[model samples]
Target: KSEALLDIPMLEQYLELVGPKLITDGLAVFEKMMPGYVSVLESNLTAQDKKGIVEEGHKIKGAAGSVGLRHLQQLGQQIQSPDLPAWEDNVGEWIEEMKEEWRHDVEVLKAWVAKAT
Candidate 1:
């Protein structure tokens, strides 16, 4: 059966282990990564950038797992699928959904990083 679970324990562990260190350090890593994302959107979602996107998706997938952001990991994997023409057909909406997804990442990251503080 499917059930919702939150990794309160791991979060606690992460906070204890990576805690305040994650604040300045982790947020810096996160913020530093924002611009290329902006550029990706500006490029009108080109093909070449997709290699980076796929790699980024893989990273996000891992990060999502670390933070128990299951849906995000799933969506990242889905979006990374090069064969998903359906996403391309609904180009505008897909892009918007993508923006939403990144917002999801930001919020999750923000929350996780906040825990450290």
Candidate 2:
């Protein structure tokens, strides 16, 4: 479900558990990690390194899921596949999409936090 990706209401419940300030703190960490994750994927894809790809994908998959980045989490899960071409075909697209999504979503989340406050 496209609408399920980054489900804002679901994320809201998670943020509530850690207290509202956690939204700001958690997003900052997520934003910082994304660029590095992209770089790792880029490098692994270029080299066609299956082990590297799987390892990197596995690393980000859990974190993405936990934070409601469902698209990224799904992409990461697919990346772990042994099908190299399948992963490569859309890796770049997802990377670009993620960068854009991260920037846009952070602002949306910040606004939500402000409203909640």
Candidate 3:
């Protein structure tokens, strides 16, 4: 057998409830979102704009929760969810951190899908 793909415990609930279908669907959605996530991060990095990061993070954090990617949700929320009154630090550093995490997560998931499924 191949190695595990994602941080499985973080995804266990989604996998348990939806089975492989969620994985496939999430793969599709995650791919679509990754570009936008990267774009926003790149934009903020280049612009040195706090609002750009926070605003996009707000959008991504909610979508991540809706899609049941718990880690992504937490990462986005860590910077500051729109649900919150305001941001905490909300710097470009965390934006890069989250984007890097998202890249790693997706890369692993893609590898898993190819090998395991």
Candidate 4:
């Protein structure tokens, strides 16, 4: 089953704090940068670079959190988890899930920004 991707209240709070234009701009920047991050994430996974994966996961977590992409943020957190065995076993799956979810989240956020701005 599909779950809610965007955290509406978090987005509302961010809009209140940053105002419409800045929040929209932040989202735009996130949208622009995420693919690069994802590419690096893929590379890190392929190389089995745990440090690289964790670092990139942290980046993705913060970026998604900032933009209120709740599911993506959680995925990032999972990707960054420190449990060695879990990380080794499930990191690939998490990255794949992040990529799939991010595509949907981006479209949703774009529509939200278009409406809110």
Identify the leading candidate in terms of lDDT.
4
Backbone clashes in model 2, listed as residue pairs: none
What lDDT would candidate 1 get against the real structure? 0.54
* Candidates sorted by lDDT, best first: 4, 2, 3, 1
Better by lDDT, candidate 4 or 1: 4
Q: How much does candidate 2 score in TM-score?
A: 0.71
* lDDT per model vs. reference: 0.54, 0.69, 0.64, 0.84
Best by TM-score: 4
| Comparing 1 and 3 on lDDT, the stronger one | 3
Flag clash pairs in model 1: none
Which 10 successive residues of model 3 have the least lDDT summed? 1-10
Clash pairs, model 4 backbone: none
Off by over 4 Å in 4: 1-3
Candidate 2 residue-wise lDDT, 1-117, digit = tens: 335556667767776677776657777788788788878877877787768878888887777776666667776777666576756577656655655665665566566667766
Instruction: Give the Cα error of residue 92 in candidate 3, in Å.
Output: 1.4
After TM-score superposition, what is the CA distance of residue 67 in candidate 1 from its true location, in Å? Answer: 6.6
Model 3, runs deviating above 4 Å = 1-10, 45-49, 81-90, 109-117
lDDT of 3 by residue, 1-117 (tens): 113324455455555666667677866887787787768767875786767766777777776666445567677776654345444444455677776777666666666555544
lDDT of 4 at 66: 84
Local accuracy of candidate 4 as per-residue lDDT tens digits, 1-117: 123788888777777777778767788899889899999999999998989999999999999988788889989998998685687889999998888778778888778767766
